[PDB]
């Protein structure tokens, strides 16, 4: 097998080259110059951080825990980078018997990275950032499965290969008009660089899964946390975008698929700079109280539609 090794090393570079965009686009959004000194346009700085944070930075926590803690950055990468495997792409690595089920299960398993980092420090200061990270993720897992079901019943089955073929004339944004707007919010269930987000950034509280971790484990967390942002951006570009298929020419698909994802890649960092944090209590009131009755009403609506007019795979 060569394909897996050709989907980790160039992918870790994409999370590395993200650091440019994380302060270049975000910089111009705030009217400030980002990467400039290090490279021609600061292009040598993202690869410099790998030399900076791993080879020279040494920390291990004080009071600590036993085997757990250092188990958590292994759980961070080894569950978020595996998410690249079930992706349909032009051609998938081992096409699943049911596609999106593996995508939804491993995403919830990726939440454990911020959960086990609560017991990284035995001291109570770190676990407050963990307990906040529970509720900021636990509620949004409800709608994430429901809004999927309304799209999946509209087009094909759980298999991700069928989701490419179903969009031949028009996108799925237009039939699922309120549901597409939900997937700019529901995608930010995992601790991502955003305005909605979770307990990961500083601002008000101490940094979750970062105050306990070093540099080396803490550096490994960013290579997983920012990796999930690309993952949700690609996953939205499958469920809601498509444009064309073309099995004969893979070259025409690969260029067209990347532009659609890159426009969404900018959009989350667009969200991050623009708006403040939603608060621990009031994020639980955005969904559950307000958005859950809306999504279920649309779920009720999407059950009737294949019966009203023929729509069965």
């Amino acid at each position: 097998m060569i394909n897996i090794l050709m989907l980790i090393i160039p992918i870790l570079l994409a999370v590395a080259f993200l650091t440019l965009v994380e302060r270049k686009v975000l910089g111009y959004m705030q009217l400030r110059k980002g990467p400039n000194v290090v490279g021609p346009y600061g292009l040598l700085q993202p690869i410099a951080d790998a030399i900076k944070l791993f080879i020279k930075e040494p920390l291990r926590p004080a009071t600590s825990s036993a085997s757990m803690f250092i188990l958590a950055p292994i759980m961070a990468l080894g569950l978020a980078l595996t998410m690249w495997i079930p992706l349909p792409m032009p051609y998938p690595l081992i096409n699943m018997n049911l596609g999106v089920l593996f995508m939804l299960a491993m995403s919830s398993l990726a939440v454990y990275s911020i959960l086990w980092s609560g017991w990284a420090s035995n001291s109570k200061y770190a676990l407050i950032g963990a307990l906040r990270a529970v509720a900021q993720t636990i509620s949004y897992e409800v709608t994430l499965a429901i809004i999927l079901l309304s799209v999946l019943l509209m087009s094909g089955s759980f298999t991700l290969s069928t989701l490419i073929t179903t969009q031949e004339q028009m996108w799925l944004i237009l039939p699922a008009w309120p549901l597409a707007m939900m997937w700019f919010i529901s995608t930010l269930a995992e601790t991502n660089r955003a305005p909605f987000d979770l307990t990961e950034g500083e601002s008000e509280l101490v940094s979750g899964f970062n105050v306990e971790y070093a540099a080396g484990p803490f550096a490994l967390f960013f290579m997983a946390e920012y990796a999930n942002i690309i993952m949700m951006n690609i996953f939205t570009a499958i469920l809601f975008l498509g444009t064309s298929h073309n099995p004969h020419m893979p070259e025409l698909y690969t260029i067209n698929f990347t532009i659609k994802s890159l426009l969404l890649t900018m959009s989350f960092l667009w969200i991050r700079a623009s708006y403040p944090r939603f608060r621990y209590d009031q994020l639980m009131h955005l969904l559950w109280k307000n958005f859950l009755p809306l999504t279920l009403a649309l779920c009720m609506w999407h059950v009737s539609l294949p019966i009203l007019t023929s729509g069965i795979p």
């Binding site: 109570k124 200061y125 500083e202 601002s203 008000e204 101490v206």
Partner: protein, 54 residues
Amino acid sequence: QPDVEWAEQYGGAVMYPTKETAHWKPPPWNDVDPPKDTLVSNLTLNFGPQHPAA
């Protein structure tokens, strides 16, 4: 005739008394006193000193 002295033997304890253990108390008439006591559950924080971003 039966008096209060005979009635005290049939009072809430152990019916037949004795036994290795007699630590049990008669039950309160309308459930137990609040065990309001024990555990304050007050969490202390050192949020300030330096760099809380706030």
